[PDB]
Write an enzyme that holds these catalytic residues in place. Sequence first.
Site, short mmCIF file in Angstrom:
data_model
loop_
_atom_site.label_atom_id
_atom_site.label_comp_id
_atom_site.label_asym_id
_atom_site.label_seq_id
_atom_site.Cartn_x
_atom_site.Cartn_y
_atom_site.Cartn_z
N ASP D 91 0.83 -1.21 0.00
CA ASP D 91 0.00 0.00 0.00
C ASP D 91 0.86 1.26 0.00
O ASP D 91 0.31 2.33 0.27
CB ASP D 91 -0.93 -0.03 1.21
CG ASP D 91 -0.23 0.00 2.55
OD1 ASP D 91 1.03 0.14 2.58
OD2 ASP D 91 -0.97 -0.13 3.56
N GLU D 113 0.08 -8.88 -2.94
CA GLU D 113 -0.80 -8.62 -1.77
C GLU D 113 -1.86 -7.58 -2.18
O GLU D 113 -1.91 -6.47 -1.59
CB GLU D 113 0.01 -8.17 -0.56
CG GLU D 113 -0.82 -8.18 0.71
CD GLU D 113 -0.20 -7.42 1.86
OE1 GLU D 113 -0.31 -6.16 1.89
OE2 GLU D 113 0.38 -8.10 2.75
N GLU D 127 -2.45 5.38 2.34
CA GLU D 127 -2.34 3.92 2.05
C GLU D 127 -3.63 3.39 1.40
O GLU D 127 -3.55 2.62 0.45
CB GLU D 127 -2.00 3.14 3.33
CG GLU D 127 -0.55 3.29 3.75
CD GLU D 127 -0.14 4.58 4.46
OE1 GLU D 127 -1.06 5.38 4.82
OE2 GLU D 127 1.09 4.80 4.62
N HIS D 195 2.99 1.44 15.68
CA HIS D 195 3.70 2.43 14.83
C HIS D 195 2.78 3.38 14.07
O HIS D 195 3.33 4.35 13.52
CB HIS D 195 4.64 1.74 13.84
CG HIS D 195 3.96 1.02 12.73
ND1 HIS D 195 3.48 1.65 11.59
CD2 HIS D 195 3.67 -0.29 12.58
CE1 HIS D 195 2.92 0.76 10.79
NE2 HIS D 195 3.05 -0.44 11.37
N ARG D 197 0.79 6.25 12.39
CA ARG D 197 0.84 7.73 12.53
C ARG D 197 -0.46 8.22 13.17
O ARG D 197 -0.37 9.06 14.06
CB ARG D 197 1.15 8.39 11.18
CG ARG D 197 -0.03 8.56 10.24
CD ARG D 197 0.43 8.98 8.83
NE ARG D 197 1.21 10.22 8.73
CZ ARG D 197 1.84 10.67 7.63
NH1 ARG D 197 1.79 9.99 6.49
NH2 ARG D 197 2.51 11.81 7.69
N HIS D 228 9.25 1.24 16.86
CA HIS D 228 9.35 1.81 15.49
C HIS D 228 10.36 2.96 15.52
O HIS D 228 10.40 3.72 16.48
CB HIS D 228 7.95 2.20 15.01
CG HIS D 228 7.86 2.70 13.61
ND1 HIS D 228 7.28 3.93 13.36
CD2 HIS D 228 8.22 2.19 12.40
CE1 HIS D 228 7.28 4.16 12.06
NE2 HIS D 228 7.82 3.10 11.45
O1 LIG Z 1 11.11 -5.20 15.48
C1 LIG Z 1 10.45 -5.65 14.54
C2 LIG Z 1 9.06 -5.38 14.27
C3 LIG Z 1 8.49 -5.91 13.17
N1 LIG Z 1 9.17 -6.71 12.29
C4 LIG Z 1 8.53 -7.21 11.03
O2 LIG Z 1 8.13 -6.08 10.28
C5 LIG Z 1 6.92 -6.38 9.52
C6 LIG Z 1 5.88 -5.36 9.89
O3 LIG Z 1 6.32 -4.06 9.47
P1 LIG Z 1 5.51 -2.80 9.94
O4 LIG Z 1 6.39 -1.61 10.00
O5 LIG Z 1 4.72 -3.00 11.20
O6 LIG Z 1 4.49 -2.72 8.66
P2 LIG Z 1 3.02 -3.31 8.45
O7 LIG Z 1 2.05 -2.56 9.28
O8 LIG Z 1 3.10 -4.80 8.60
O9 LIG Z 1 2.78 -3.21 6.85
C7 LIG Z 1 2.06 -2.21 6.16
O10 LIG Z 1 2.75 -1.96 4.94
C8 LIG Z 1 2.89 -3.13 4.09
C9 LIG Z 1 3.53 -2.65 2.81
O11 LIG Z 1 2.74 -1.62 2.19
C10 LIG Z 1 1.53 -3.83 3.84
O12 LIG Z 1 1.78 -5.09 3.31
C11 LIG Z 1 0.70 -4.00 5.11
O13 LIG Z 1 -0.62 -4.43 4.78
C12 LIG Z 1 0.65 -2.71 5.87
O14 LIG Z 1 -0.09 -2.91 7.06
C13 LIG Z 1 6.56 -7.84 9.85
O15 LIG Z 1 6.94 -8.78 8.84
C14 LIG Z 1 7.28 -8.08 11.19
O16 LIG Z 1 7.61 -9.45 11.23
C15 LIG Z 1 10.52 -6.97 12.46
O17 LIG Z 1 11.17 -7.63 11.67
N2 LIG Z 1 11.08 -6.44 13.59
#
Ligand SMILES: O=c1ccn([C@@H]2O[C@H](COP(=O)(O)OP(=O)(O)O[C@H]3O[C@H](CO)[C@@H](O)[C@H](O)[C@H]3O)[C@@H](O)[C@H]2O)c(=O)[nH]1
Lengths: 372, 367, 365, 357
Positions: D91, D113, D127, D195, D197, D228
């Site tokens: 997104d 996705e 997004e 995380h 916003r 984050h």
């Molecule tokens: O300390 C940490 C915390 C998280 N993760 C990983 O980070 C990812 C999550 O990343 P995050 O920053 O929380 O992003 P999301 O909220 O998962 O992803 C958003 O952004 C992605 C790309 O646009 C979309 O696929 C998702 O639907 C959307 O919610 C996951 O695989 C976790 O396993 C780590 O490796 N280490």
Amino acid sequence: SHMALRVGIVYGTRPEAIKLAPLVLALDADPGFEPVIITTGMLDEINELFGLRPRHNLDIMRPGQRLSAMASRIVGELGDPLLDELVDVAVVQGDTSTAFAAAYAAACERIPVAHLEAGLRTGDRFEPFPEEINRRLITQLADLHFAPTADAAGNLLAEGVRSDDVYVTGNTVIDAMHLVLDRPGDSANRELDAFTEGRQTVLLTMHRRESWGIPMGRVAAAVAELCRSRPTLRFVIPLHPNPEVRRVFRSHLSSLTQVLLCEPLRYSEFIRLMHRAVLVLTDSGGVQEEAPTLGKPVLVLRDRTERPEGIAAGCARLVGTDPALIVKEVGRLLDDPEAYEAMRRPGIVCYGEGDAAARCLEALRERWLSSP
Amino acid sequence: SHMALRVGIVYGTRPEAIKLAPLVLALDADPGFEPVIITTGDMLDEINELFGLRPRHNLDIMGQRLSAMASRIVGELGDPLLDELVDVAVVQGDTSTAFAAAYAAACERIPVAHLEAGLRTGDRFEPFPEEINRRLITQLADLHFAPTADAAGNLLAEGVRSDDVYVTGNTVIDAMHLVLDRPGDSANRELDAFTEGRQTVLLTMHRRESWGIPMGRVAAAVAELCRSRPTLRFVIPLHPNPEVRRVFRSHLSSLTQVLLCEPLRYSEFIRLMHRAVLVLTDSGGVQEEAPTLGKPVLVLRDRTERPEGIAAGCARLVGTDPALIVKEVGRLLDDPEAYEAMRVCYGEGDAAARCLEALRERWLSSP
Amino acid sequence: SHMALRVGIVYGTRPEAIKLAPLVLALDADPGFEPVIITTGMLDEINELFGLRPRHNLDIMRPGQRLSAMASRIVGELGDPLLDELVDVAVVQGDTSTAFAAAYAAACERIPVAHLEAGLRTGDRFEPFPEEINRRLITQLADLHFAPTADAAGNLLAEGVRSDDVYVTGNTVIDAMHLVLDRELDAFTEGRQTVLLTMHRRESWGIPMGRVAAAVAELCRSRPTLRFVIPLHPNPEVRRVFRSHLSSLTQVLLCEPLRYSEFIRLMHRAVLVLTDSGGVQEEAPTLGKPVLVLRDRTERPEGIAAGCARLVGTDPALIVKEVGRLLDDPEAYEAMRRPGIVCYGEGDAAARCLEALRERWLSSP
Amino acid sequence: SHMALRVGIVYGTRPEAIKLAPLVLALDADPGFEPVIITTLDEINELFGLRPRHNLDIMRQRLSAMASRIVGELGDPLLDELVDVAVVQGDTSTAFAAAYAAACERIPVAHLEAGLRTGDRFEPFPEEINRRLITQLADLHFAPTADAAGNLLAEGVRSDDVYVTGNTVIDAMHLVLRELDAFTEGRQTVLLTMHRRESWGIPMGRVAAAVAELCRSRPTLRFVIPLHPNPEVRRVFRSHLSSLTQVLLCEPLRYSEFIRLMHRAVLVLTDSGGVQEEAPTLGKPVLVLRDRTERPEGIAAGCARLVGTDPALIVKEVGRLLDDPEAYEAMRRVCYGEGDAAARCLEALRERWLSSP
Ligand SMILES: O=c1ccn([C@@H]2O[C@H](COP(=O)(O)OP(=O)(O)O[C@H]3O[C@H](CO)[C@@H](O)[C@H](O)[C@H]3O)[C@@H](O)[C@H]2O)c(=O)[nH]1
Ligand SMILES: O=c1ccn([C@@H]2O[C@H](COP(=O)(O)OP(=O)(O)O[C@H]3O[C@H](CO)[C@@H](O)[C@H](O)[C@H]3O)[C@@H](O)[C@H]2O)c(=O)[nH]1
Ligand SMILES: O=c1ccn([C@@H]2O[C@H](COP(=O)(O)OP(=O)(O)O[C@H]3O[C@H](CO)[C@@H](O)[C@H](O)[C@H]3O)[C@@H](O)[C@H]2O)c(=O)[nH]1
Ligand SMILES: O=c1ccn([C@@H]2O[C@H](COP(=O)(O)OP(=O)(O)O[C@H]3O[C@H](CO)[C@@H](O)[C@H](O)[C@H]3O)[C@@H](O)[C@H]2O)c(=O)[nH]1
Ligand code: NA
Ligand code: NA
Ligand code: NA
């Protein structure tokens, strides 16, 4: 001193300016609204005719420029004038890369977007490119959609637009036509009158990039053949301002006394000429809307149309760029008065009644000048 | 409102503007055409004012390296040609503007016509870059307006098809006729006061290959003729280059018999040439203008692109040899038979109309 | 420490690099000369293979750029490296906008120009654009012209070039072939009749290339034993047309561009060659391979006149017919390989260029 | 030397890199394809062995300026690298601007996705609109679920352009499956990531207060909170929790270490999209710190519950799961695919772009 809804109006081309002009005039006259024009891009001439006064001209568009470079500039640079002019809501029109890039630039500043002439579809993916994809992108960005027809409103619902965000306003091009039919002084043209007076005149416009070169050459050959076979027939061909388009028509037709090749005509003079024509050959979207409203049969120089209403009602027929079919179809209409009359329904309206600007204004007032 | 053939007119210099002016005026008057002027180069404003030329765009491109100037014209001329919806582009003569503009037009698939096509010395890269510019323009141009049968022959020898070559004559004759028909605008009080009652020689000299020592020898020849012939006068309009002005000024500024001038308006220059007893020049245009006014021409070069005047005895090559210049001017002033032996090479003054008809035949016709 | 004639070598494309490589090698080996390479633009791979070491890479050329912008940059910027490298004379090759703009940039600095592979003509004005006009502009700028054939030399004289400025050297592409003549592809071609096909010309993009791909498909259906190898020009539109028509056909191997050595080995193994390439029209007859030319015109009329090559355009029925004739009738096949004529030179073109350079610029009257 | 389909891979963030990594590895291993990576993290690239051909140094900054730069500058590397087809994921404004830049060069686009929706217009921004724009630009859509495929059809996508591949995050998890060990060893550990916003400041403060209250009431409970990398997010958690011995505030964890920690946790509180997919796959109940989710499948199956940023509800819901083993088991048991999503994407790419009729 009461608050006006400040409505951004963004366009770069003649067809956009023509279709936005009635909305600008209605916004100017209504005390609840203030139009703010920003251009991205012939245009001075349309601005003068309708009394449109741009607050900002971004000098972004030009021939021989990459789509990505132009879209990059509009996305990057339109935000500042929209913020500087305190725009509340932004209106874009039609299918242009300006309409798409400006809608995105407005969305980036959380300025709500309205789309004038929303929901036209061929159903042919990326045909033409980029206009077909631009419409589908604008459709996702726009809060409010002014659909010219029930069919166009249906196309919007099929792309997940909520019914409350769609208004069937009709097409503002009908408003625009009526405004210049009411302006005889500006409509007059001595040379065009002298050439058409007492003759069957075919009006032909053709501009689409996908038809440049060979396909336009076939259409020009069809014109030449019709002229040879029918000494009393005349053509007026106002040429799109592209040197390749001018060269193909000029090299095929410049010696034929039966063809008047023209510079682009002021909208008032073009509508007067269309009223005098016996029939219209065009690949123009707007002319497919204007010509049936003047009771002129239209032969469409394309393999597809975004105006299926005229096809279904028999006002218009697809003819493509096949010279044998063009010769045949023009012949049928000139020779058989029953075939001619079957293409005229001049007491029936496909594309609206000419009150589209007022219907847009009332949609804007309902959405953005109301509280629950 | 009928379609006009939109004809781009691109120039940067006085001689180009003079030769294009009659074609601009003919294109303006004819309803089938629209001239669109784009300049690349206050000598030019003065020529624009005199003939009523109104540039749509001034590029402000032209002490600068050739490659940088040509780079800018190739890079930047396309946009105004496209913005102005030019159908066909006309370039004139031998300038780097004419070459770079023809190339810029070709890049946009705008057809090119060359005004004053086919002049050759036969001396490779002499002068540089003018001799090569003509041969490059010759390959780029669809249509060639040759001033003479000899020039048309030079084009065929470089592989140009006969159907693409028209012998139109030289538009400089048209230009001369336009200002001869304007006595009011041709008048000049100071020139009349200086020349009244005396035999006046007209001298122009500008070519880069003659700067410094060769121009100094020509100035010495003028000084010697003045000393030997107290009744003789010279008028010398100076090319606007500081080095040219300095050589003539440092050799001649104290001689009461020499009037060193600023560049003259074309109307006043042609009236002066009509009054002159003879003309010394390295100018291409003056080699065409002077014989048309019945003035013997001594050519301050070792070569000419106007061999017709040489063959007909209208003009003689004199180079920059001061002894030969003194001798040849003396012969013409002293011996009325030698004078009469030196009085159409370059056309009848209808060259603009012949260009227009070639343009109409090529680009306003259908099979 | 003796003075060498410093010879600028300017190119931006694979075909230029292949044709200039034998001249660079001859200039490098001869003590009277020093080659100085300036690139404007696959090329690293050709540079590595022949041991070409560019002194300067200008990084001007691009996939999506206006001709005027590219030509403006070369005219504007090539002068500085030519002056910095103390170039005495500049060589350009072929018909590219690099060759034209570099010749002009050299002329602006009063650096004399020599044109490698001079005088090829179709006689069709601005077809293709800008290559046909580039040749005629380079022809006026160049002091010295290396014509591959007597026919090409004749075309130069008809454009007013003096006879003393024209040398029939032959084509350096024959030299280049000879240099490289001295595994997945092997596995695919081993037991089989293999047609080699290359097609790249902009004027044939989309529908015409689609017709050629349909001809390939039809030949494959009708002749189960037939194979095609098609190295694809690096343009996404060219790749898309061949891929969308042929990617499922087991009898067609669509390839990435091949290194020149591998491409020449494949051409030697092929039964015949279908191409719109200028160079392949010269290379294939030299290996005794009949050539069918996928164009309506050629700048190599010598191969047509000698029966080595035939024009076939982009007509699928004619391509199917002409390939069929050559596979089925051994007399028709042999008529396109008949000995007794050498069209484009014997592979000594670099040495003939060197001796022309020495006579013109390393002599005094 | 045989022709490979050259597949552009464009991303700028950790979640995109994690979800694209299995597709890059499958494209690399298959001889019919060549992946070409253009970035807009080094640690994630190193872990999965991703080697970017180009890094555009664009991201940091106004949305319009960033989107303008990607639209303006991505075309040149796509053309230089002879990309045939381009894949974007998720997104992001990168995914949208890169899909548009590819479309401008007539490079076909596939969306990894595809079809996740909340149904809340411009929430979050940008997004939610990015997904709807990518949806119109993409020729091919890799939907993780039947529900996501249904959302694509409702926006006028043809059924033939939609493949239910499952989510490559399951593939990524499978590929990866000392201070942290010492802190968690004998203890019930809650894993918390937050995380978004829209939750910055006061809402995150309420979540931190819920953590504080749970810690005071349950001396045996531990929390690990990888933060984050935003100074405002770090400040809210640090100022509420840095003195609590029962909370380990962490730097972002490497993906392999994060998945191991999640496996050891008793339950997961998150506003992460990816963690909503990963946690149920390890049999960990998820409480979602949002008012909406793009993963309704986990909600419907009882794997996940919405808890928002209401501290009383968070305390209650975490209490229920720790205290009532029947409530715990009701949240454990495939919602998001089987871990073969990369291979299903590859076969869709081969069918669409490495076939002739
Ligand atoms: O300390 C940490 C915390 C998280 N993760 C990983 O980070 C990812 C999550 O990343 P995050 O920053 O929380 O992003 P999301 O909220 O998962 O992803 C958003 O952004 C992605 C790309 O646009 C979309 O696929 C998702 O639907 C959307 O919610 C996951 O695989 C976790 O396993 C780590 O490796 N280490
Ligand atoms: O000499 C002329 C010729 C045409 N017109 C008028 O110009 C408009 C047509 O402009 P044209 O360039 O032909 O564009 P269209 O093809 O009509 O418009 C395209 O672009 C618009 C803006 O995106 C969309 O609304 C249309 O659906 C799409 O077809 C009409 O109002 C005509 O009456 C003139 O005023 N003078
Ligand atoms: O004080 C003066 C002096 C000259 N002229 C006129 O200026 C023109 C000549 O200009 P000049 O600078 O001397 O140029 P030329 O040498 O005549 O022209 C060169 O450049 C032209 C443009 O490329 C080519 O057509 C010519 O062949 C070439 O010789 C003539 O018409 C003169 O009548 C004036 O109007 N006033
Ligand atoms: O996979 C391949 C395909 C071709 N080649 C070689 O590459 C050259 C062909 O290159 P190509 O891109 O087809 O260009 P051409 O059409 O040969 O060359 C054009 O451009 C040249 C440079 O201006 C001119 O000399 C030619 O006349 C003109 O036809 C030949 O040596 C081939 O053997 C390879 O090495 N690998
Ligand atoms: Na108002
Ligand atoms: Na006129
Ligand atoms: Na050497």
